[PDB]
Design an enzyme around this catalytic site. Structure first.
Site, PDB file in Angstrom:
ATOM      1  N   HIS A 139       0.842  -1.309  -0.168  1.00 46.16           N
ATOM      2  CA  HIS A 139      -0.019   0.057   0.056  1.00 46.16           C
ATOM      3  C   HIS A 139       0.916   1.114  -0.079  1.00 46.16           C
ATOM      4  O   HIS A 139       0.404   2.238  -0.379  1.00 46.16           O
ATOM      5  CB  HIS A 139      -0.966   0.203   1.134  1.00 46.16           C
ATOM      6  N   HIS A 193       6.349   7.040   5.607  1.00 51.05           N
ATOM      7  CA  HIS A 193       5.881   6.320   4.231  1.00 51.05           C
ATOM      8  C   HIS A 193       4.951   7.742   3.794  1.00 51.05           C
ATOM      9  O   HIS A 193       5.041   8.925   4.282  1.00 51.05           O
ATOM     10  CB  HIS A 193       4.794   5.269   4.440  1.00 51.05           C
ATOM     11  N   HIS A 221       1.899   8.818   0.886  1.00 51.14           N
ATOM     12  CA  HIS A 221       0.626   8.763  -0.079  1.00 51.14           C
ATOM     13  C   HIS A 221       0.820   9.700  -1.289  1.00 51.14           C
ATOM     14  O   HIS A 221       1.239  10.902  -0.971  1.00 51.14           O
ATOM     15  CB  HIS A 221      -0.791   8.966   0.815  1.00 51.14           C
ATOM     16  N   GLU A 245      -3.829  13.173   1.731  1.00 50.24           N
ATOM     17  CA  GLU A 245      -4.966  12.553   2.594  1.00 50.24           C
ATOM     18  C   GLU A 245      -5.442  13.871   3.180  1.00 50.24           C
ATOM     19  O   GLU A 245      -6.780  13.868   3.049  1.00 50.24           O
ATOM     20  CB  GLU A 245      -4.243  11.619   3.492  1.00 50.24           C
ATOM     21  N   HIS A 305       4.120  10.998   5.896  1.00 50.57           N
ATOM     22  CA  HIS A 305       3.675  10.516   7.521  1.00 50.57           C
ATOM     23  C   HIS A 305       4.735  10.129   8.155  1.00 50.57           C
ATOM     24  O   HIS A 305       5.326   8.873   7.693  1.00 50.57           O
ATOM     25  CB  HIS A 305       2.584   9.630   7.180  1.00 50.57           C
ATOM     26  N   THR A 342      -5.160   6.093   8.927  1.00 54.63           N
ATOM     27  CA  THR A 342      -5.676   6.002   7.573  1.00 54.63           C
ATOM     28  C   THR A 342      -5.741   4.989   6.648  1.00 54.63           C
ATOM     29  O   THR A 342      -6.238   4.982   5.486  1.00 54.63           O
ATOM     30  CB  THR A 342      -5.024   7.397   6.923  1.00 54.63           C
ATOM     31  N   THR A 343      -5.095   4.091   7.261  1.00 51.59           N
ATOM     32  CA  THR A 343      -5.110   2.757   6.456  1.00 51.59           C
ATOM     33  C   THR A 343      -5.728   1.636   7.324  1.00 51.59           C
ATOM     34  O   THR A 343      -5.445   1.754   8.737  1.00 51.59           O
ATOM     35  CB  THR A 343      -3.829   2.218   5.776  1.00 51.59           C
TER      36      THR A 343
HETATM   37  C1  LIG Z   1       1.423   0.537  13.736  1.00 48.18           C
HETATM   38  C2  LIG Z   1       2.313   0.384  12.210  1.00 48.18           C
HETATM   39  C3  LIG Z   1       1.651   1.737  11.557  1.00 48.18           C
HETATM   40  O1  LIG Z   1       2.310   2.783  11.636  1.00 48.18           O
HETATM   41  N1  LIG Z   1       0.513   1.603  11.033  1.00 48.18           N
HETATM   42  C4  LIG Z   1      -0.192   3.045  10.303  1.00 48.18           C
HETATM   43  N2  LIG Z   1      -1.418   2.597   9.821  1.00 48.18           N
HETATM   44  N3  LIG Z   1      -1.986   4.074   9.252  1.00 48.18           N
HETATM   45  C5  LIG Z   1      -0.683   4.815   9.737  1.00 48.18           C
HETATM   46  S1  LIG Z   1      -0.960   6.549   8.796  1.00 48.18           S
HETATM   47  N4  LIG Z   1      -1.464   6.269   7.024  1.00 48.18           N
HETATM   48  O2  LIG Z   1      -2.128   6.899   9.577  1.00 48.18           O
HETATM   49  O3  LIG Z   1       0.341   7.311   9.119  1.00 48.18           O
HETATM   50  S2  LIG Z   1       0.659   4.333  10.185  1.00 48.18           S
HETATM   51 ZN   LIG Z   2      -0.127   7.509   6.058  1.00 50.28          ZN
END
Ligand SMILES: CCC(=O)Nc1nnc(S(N)(=O)=O)s1
Ligand SMILES: [Zn+2]
Length: 257
Positions: A61, A91, A93, A103, A116, A195-196
């Site tokens: 993803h 990471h 998006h 996002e 992020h 957000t995932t």
């Molecule tokens: C616990 C591992 C982790 O980091 N999971 C995440 N799931 N969504 C994230 S986001 N897109 O809100 O930064 S991070």
């Molecule tokens: Zn993210």
């Protein structure tokens, strides 16, 4: 399994993760004229000088750079946060075109991408426990616009050819995430979610007002990654963003006037 396609995208996620329709879901549109300046908010403290990056990974993803979070090496504190949050990973998006990809949005404006930096509250000991707490994680969100290149991003983009498909990873040491930060640490903050999937409602969001600029060549490299694993029909990893969710009973606060 979930994804960003027509049949498994964000509109479908609530079937496996019913919290998708919850009371503090992310991302949201940041209405700059409604966000209230909060003079009680402290400056963000970003202490990345001792960061230890480990690996870069295509997880199907996004792509993710992971850090050693076994010690207080790269930590986020202050701002709206109580206590110390350890950097786990960052990471992005991004979109298929420059007019979409972020996002969060700002007065409905979408940026080309969103970075992020994910941190977890050391009072909970590990990230798996932190995701079960309403103040377990702090994600620092940074918008990307397309223009001049970001020199500090180039080391990331140059290894993406080695992690093209889901499941591929590579050693990625000595990467300094300070080279991804804009000048100002002015921010908006609100309580939200991952957000995932699993979309857990564990995140204090800290979204920087100032974008960073990346070049078209840099973001074109993002768009060459694959959602699929090697040997499967090639599906470009593009438009891996969840759209803005209802703000519901939440206030976005600004650190700046
Ligand atoms: C616990 C591992 C982790 O980091 N999971 C995440 N799931 N969504 C994230 S986001 N897109 O809100 O930064 S991070
Ligand atoms: Zn993210």
């Amino acid at each position: 399994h979930w994804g960003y396609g027509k049949h498994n995208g964000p509109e479908h996620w609530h079937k496996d993760f019913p919290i998708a329709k919850g009371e503090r879901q992310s991302p949201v549109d940041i209405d700059t004229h409604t966000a209230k300046y909060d003079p009680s908010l402290k400056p963000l403290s970003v202490s990345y000088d001792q960061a230890t990056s480990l690996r870069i990974l295509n997880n199907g993803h996004s792509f993710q750079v992971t850090f050693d979070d076994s010690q207080d090496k790269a930590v986020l504190k202050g701002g709206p946060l109580d206590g110390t949050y350890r950097l786990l990973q960052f990471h992005f998006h991004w979109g298929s075109l420059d007019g979409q990809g972020s996002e969060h949005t700002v007065d409905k404006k979408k940026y080309a991408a969103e970075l992020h930096l994910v941190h977890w509250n050391t009072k909970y000991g590990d990230v798996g426990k932190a995701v079960q707490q309403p103040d377990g994680l702090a994600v620092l969100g940074i918008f990307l616009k397309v223009g001049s290149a970001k020199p500090g991003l180039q080391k990331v983009v140059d290894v993406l050819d080695s992690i093209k498909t889901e499941g591929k990873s590579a050693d990625f040491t000595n990467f300094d995430p300070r080279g991804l930060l804009p000048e100002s640490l002015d921010y908006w903050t609100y309580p939200g979610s991952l957000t995932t999937p699993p979309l857990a409602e564990c995140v204090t969001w800290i979204v920087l007002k100032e974008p960073i600029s990346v070049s078209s060549e840099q973001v074109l490299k993002f768009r060459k990654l694959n959602f699929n694993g090697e040997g499967e029909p090639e599906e470009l990893m593009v438009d891996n963003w969840r759209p803005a969710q209802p703000l519901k009973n939440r206030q976005i606060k600004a650190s700046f006037k």
